[PDB]
Design a protein around this ligand. Structure first.
Ligand SMILES: Nc1nc2c(ncn2[C@@H]2O[C@H](COP(=O)(O)OP(=O)(O)NP(=O)(O)O)[C@@H](O)[C@H]2O)c(=O)[nH]1
Ligand SMILES: COc1cccc(-c2ccc(Nc3ccc(C[NH+](C)C)cc3)c(OC)c2)c1
Ligand SMILES: [Mg+2]
Length: 171
């Protein structure tokens, strides 16, 4: 019996400065944050309708630069889907995606975790990562790729909604 709307626990991961917080705040507040305030851990919530189903997104916004914590592994165990974010002007953030994916596969002990690859800051002219490279990486992992800008709001809804659709397909 229906006791309230379905809830989805999403975790936003990726290197320092790629725009994880900016993406989340654009989704929740329709606000672009220009300042860089490094995150340790922040929790957000939003009700949306995706494909005719009302649901609640519980979003955990993570730290880019973090050593081994068992506290980190805990929320990666409970998270049901992961936005893996790099910045299209930062090649290192793109190469770090492999490390986030491995970390997630290890803690969930699974090959088939709901995930979306997100290439953020697509409004900047200093692209160093081609769309095609990122699409090929996503195709090799069997996951969707979405280009976003927290500043223009391009792809922001889509990134989160796509992840929810991936979670739904997985169960
Ligand atoms: N032009 C542009 N700037 C962006 C975009 N997303 C984020 N930024 C900028 O990049 C900086 C870092 O954004 P922020 O969301 O804090 O990064 P983060 O990944 O949450 N960092 P951390 O892991 O330290 O928490 C900020 O100055 C922000 O305004 C984007 O899509 N376009
Ligand atoms: C442990 O690993 C996870 C992993 C992923 C998401 C979550 C999650 C995020 C936010 C909330 N909830 C929440 C969201 C925003 C606020 C802030 N309030 C001021 C509204 C409080 C709770 C949540 O609750 C079940 C779960 C937990
Ligand atoms: Mg942040």
């Amino acid at each position: 019996y229906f006791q309230g709307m379905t809830e989805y626990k999403l975790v936003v991961v990726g290197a320092g400065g790629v725009g994880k917080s900016a993406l989340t705040i654009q989704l929740i507040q329709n606000h672009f944050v220009d300042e860089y305030d490094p995150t340790i851990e922040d929790s957000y919530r939003k009700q949306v309708v995706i494909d005719g189903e009302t649901c609640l997104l519980d979003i955990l916004d993570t730290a880019g630069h973090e050593e081994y914590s068992a506290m980190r592994d805990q929320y990666m165990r409970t998270g049901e889907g992961f936005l893996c974010v790099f910045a299209i002007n930062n090649t290192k953030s793109f190469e770090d995606i492999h490390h986030y994916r491995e970390q997630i596969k290890r803690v969930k002990d699974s090959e088939d975790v709901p995930m979306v690859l997100v290439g953020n800051k697509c409004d900047l002219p200093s692209r160093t990562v081609d769309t095609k490279q990122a699409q090929d990486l996503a195709r090799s992992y069997g996951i969707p790729f979405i280009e976003t800008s927290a500043k223009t709001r391009q792809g922001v809804d889509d990134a989160f909604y796509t992840l929810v659709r991936e979670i739904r397909k997985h169960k």
